Amino acid sequence: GHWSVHAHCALTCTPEYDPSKATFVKVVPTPNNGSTELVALHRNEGEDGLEVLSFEFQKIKYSYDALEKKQFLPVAFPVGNAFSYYQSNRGFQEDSEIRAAEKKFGSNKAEMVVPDFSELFKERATAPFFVFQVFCVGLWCLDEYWYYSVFTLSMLVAFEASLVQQQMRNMSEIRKMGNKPHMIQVYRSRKWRPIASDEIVPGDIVSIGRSPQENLVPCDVLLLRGRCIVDEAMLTGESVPQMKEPIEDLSPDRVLDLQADSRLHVIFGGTKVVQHIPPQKATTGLKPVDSGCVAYVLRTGFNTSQGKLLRTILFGVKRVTANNLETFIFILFLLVFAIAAAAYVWIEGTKDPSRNRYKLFLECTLILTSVVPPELPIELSLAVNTSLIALAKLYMYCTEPFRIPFAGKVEVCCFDKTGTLTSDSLVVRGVAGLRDGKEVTPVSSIPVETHRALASCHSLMQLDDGTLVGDPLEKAMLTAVDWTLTKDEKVFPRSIKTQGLKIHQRFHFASALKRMSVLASYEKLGSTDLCYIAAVKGAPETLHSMFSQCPPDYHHIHTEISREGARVLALGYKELGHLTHQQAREVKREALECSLKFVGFIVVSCPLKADSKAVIREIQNASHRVVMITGDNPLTACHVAQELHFIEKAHTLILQPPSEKGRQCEWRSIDGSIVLPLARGSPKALALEYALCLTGDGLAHLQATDPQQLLRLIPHVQVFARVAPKQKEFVITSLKELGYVTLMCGDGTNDVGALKHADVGVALLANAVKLGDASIAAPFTSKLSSIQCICHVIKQGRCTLVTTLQMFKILALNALILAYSQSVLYLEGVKFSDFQATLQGLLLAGCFLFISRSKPLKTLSRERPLPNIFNLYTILTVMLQFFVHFLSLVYLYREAQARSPEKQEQFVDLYKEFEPSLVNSTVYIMAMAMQMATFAINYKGPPFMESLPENKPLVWSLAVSLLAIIGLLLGSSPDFNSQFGLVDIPVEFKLVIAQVLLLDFCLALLADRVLQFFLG
């Protein structure tokens, strides 16, 4: 197709080589991603007299640097600007350069336009099945069946339009899940105007902050002033919130680099801001009305990190064809047998010179159309649509309906720790260090000193409504304390008879200091004097030295708590004696750290959802493999995997990159007991001995060093930590290339890159709706935060895959039987009247529609489904059933012929009208028995899908077919078989026909079940 695309461009305009004035430029796709396309260069008047050549491919603008590089280059950004420039920046002052920068940098627009319905229909027309159907329809048009052909073509195009409409209403859900652009308070023309997110352009100054609507940050912005709490779990995967500092404090001599200074100074897009700390009024500078953090827009549009990943998916890869190689080779096999039967008909007809040639050719071509049914794609589409409707009842959507059958063949399942397995809400297990040993004591039994240390030291604030907002760590910290936090900064006990504490000065976290200090005073009991006590909390390793008295087991308890992976944070409290009112202002906020007293630790971990463990166990009992791919700290990921029984080995070892170049990588255990360098051999023995986990840094080092060892190692790794969004995609592609079908369940925008490439990708919604970005590029989307959707999808996919295998088997056998019967007996002059053929067609269509609507069982099983129709079992059973049925059909035909009156014509008149006989009636009875036996036999029942009796429409269809066969065999009503145009047969002959029918049925069932038992 792509090679065909450039032919049209060449026809339209001739290629140009001279760079003076080029009408169009061909785009090189590169083998990794992209597609071949043509873009038109844009001529712009130069204010300085210099013209710039530019083009837009995949919403990326490039430029041709005639001055220095003499080649096409992407548009330069303020990424490389000096760090001192932003200190004196006042923002955009005139609208002329605002428009200019909007032109030469782009716009912050991320909104989809859904692909056109006409374009979707044209793309659907490229399916070879539709072309084959049109060929067949025109072929019956040639066969003088013009009205029937027109009706069939109309039905086919109507159903295709219905399929496209279903895909479109699915696409509507994705469009709704797109982030609706939101108003932003922005500075322009020396004034603050409210401005929508789409029209933001780089270079402006924007005052961001915590919004009441819990909206995401619009674009990558540079924090000029103010401090804020950001939760980049959606975008970076780090569950722990991180601090952000203003740039006004730093020296101007530095040069800003995104790689080095990403974590502490640039706020990314798509993340959620939690708390905003307005700057002091003493500092003179940008003054916001909303009192949010004023900041500088670095990047916009799809050039932001979230934009990069999103776009690189959006125009990255094609939708995988619903016409796989399996169906192609199945059609090839059916057509091979079709051509064999056609050649037999042609040869024997040409053996008769009296008969015309064009008429026989038309008859043979009609046979070739009849052998390959027009419902071959229609029936599969019906089964898939029924599965999708059944799945939609579980509050889950499917934007790519054809990938449901792929769910059965999944062998490895991947999960994201944060947002999918671990809930956002965090609860405190207890307050550690207040009792002997490593045991943590509940909040009930901790002393009152710990109560006041926990309550006083917090950065939370109160709104007009009074709702508590802030760091979830501090949220649970205050919830366990349960003391009410008033708007007057007074902390009052709900159930304790203690005087409240009023905070005078609060100093927030400093990344340089790794400590956060709170100064407050309490009224002494029985007196009006104010006693000032400050409780400071922060990094335990740094805060250790500030303790005047420290227990000997401080480091030991800290290490043991850290091994558990829960966020450990030391609590401090100093007596400080008595302080005056003026001295409280005089004493600096950073001066309280000296001469501290240890009070204990607080342990906080993310609790798993209740049903996560059951789902993981159920998946593991289905001969499946489960792997964790998350970006949190490796210790926390290993602990969470251990709790969910991802890993059952006694110990698990970390793999780390070497600090010194040329040093072989060596595993270290979490406990550090076992250390062993990597061996060049297979990791099978190490995996058997203990669980294996790989970090992102180690993955990058191995990728740079040797891909081969990484590809061997990846299949046996249980936990992936500190993995980048591109590294997720690399891991998933590595698993997929080995042949394993990959399934992943993630919600953050980290998982999008890998979800797009996953065979069956499921996106979740944490804390269940904003309907986040990951659902846009995920084939499947669920509105339930739980992971039970994975189990439901696996069950549905197993049922659909088994149904598709059964459909292929039944279609193949029926097509072979019908093709041979027509080819040999129309040549023999044995044809049914139109009424019985119509009954055959309607019964077949009904029974297929009934089998396509199967229901799945509630519980999955250990047995694995057949990976594909291309196995020895399917071909062998289809062929063997064909022979066992063929022998019976030939026996019945010979039995009927030996007694029929001897033929009066050596040749056969092909257009002689129907006449009732013994032979035609016997053939019709045998064909109906054929259909009955096939639909009874090829229903692979439990444990994979509902039992045969449960499918009530199918039971009724087979029962009515059997009743019709029995009635025709008995012929109780002469009017009945008179209407069917079948002469009565003597009972003596009824005996033999019934005996051979029962023998054929029993032989087919026995052989099929024996083969299933042997090659199960």
UniProtKB/Swiss-Prot annotation:
UniProt name for this protein: Endoplasmic reticulum transmembrane helix translocase
Single GO term (MF): ATP hydrolysis activity
SUPFAM superfamilies, per the entry: Calcium ATPase, transduction domain A (SSF81653), Calcium ATPase, transmembrane domain M (SSF81665), HAD-like (SSF56784), Metal cation-transporting ATPase, ATP-binding domain N (SSF81660)
Segments of this protein annotated with the region A-domain: 82-113, 178-318
Catalyzed reactions per annotation: [protein]-with a C-terminal TM segment(out) + ATP + H2O = [protein]-with a C-terminal TM segment(in) + ADP + phosphate + H(+)
Active site: 416
Binding site for Mg(2+): 416, 418, 747
EC number: 7.4.2.-
EC main group: translocase
Cellular component aspect of the GO annotation: endoplasmic reticulum membrane; membrane
Organism: Homo sapiens
Extracellular compartment residues: 148-326, 831, 893-916, 974-986
Regions crossing the membrane: 127-147, 327-347, 810-830, 832-852, 872-892, 917-937, 953-973, 987-1007
Lineage, uppermost ranks: Eukaryota, Metazoa, Chordata, Craniata, Vertebrata
Gene: ATP13A1
Biological role stated in the UniProt entry: Endoplasmic reticulum translocase required to remove mitochondrial transmembrane proteins mistargeted to the endoplasmic reticulum. Acts as a dislocase that mediates the ATP-dependent extraction of mislocalized mitochondrial transmembrane proteins from the endoplasmic reticulum membrane. Specifically binds mitochondrial tail-anchored transmembrane proteins: has an atypically large substrate-binding pocket that recognizes and binds moderately hydrophobic transmembranes with short hydrophilic lumenal domains.
Region of interest: N-domain: 426-607
Domain notes: Contains a large substrate-binding pocket that recognizes alpha-helical transmembranes, which alternately faces the endoplasmic reticulum lumen and cytosol, while remaining accessible to the lipid bilayer through a lateral opening. The translocase alternates between two conformations: inward-open (E1) and outward-open (E2) states. Undergoes a series of conformational changes with ATP-binding, phosphorylation of the Asp active site and subsequent dephosphorylation in a Post-Albers cycle (i.e., E1 -> E1-ATP -> E1P-ADP -> E1P -> E2P -> E2-Pi -> E1).
Family: Belongs to the cation transport ATPase (P-type) (TC 3.A.3) family. Type V subfamily.
Record's keyword annotation contains Cell wall biogenesis/degradation: no
Topology in the lipid bilayer: Multi-pass membrane protein
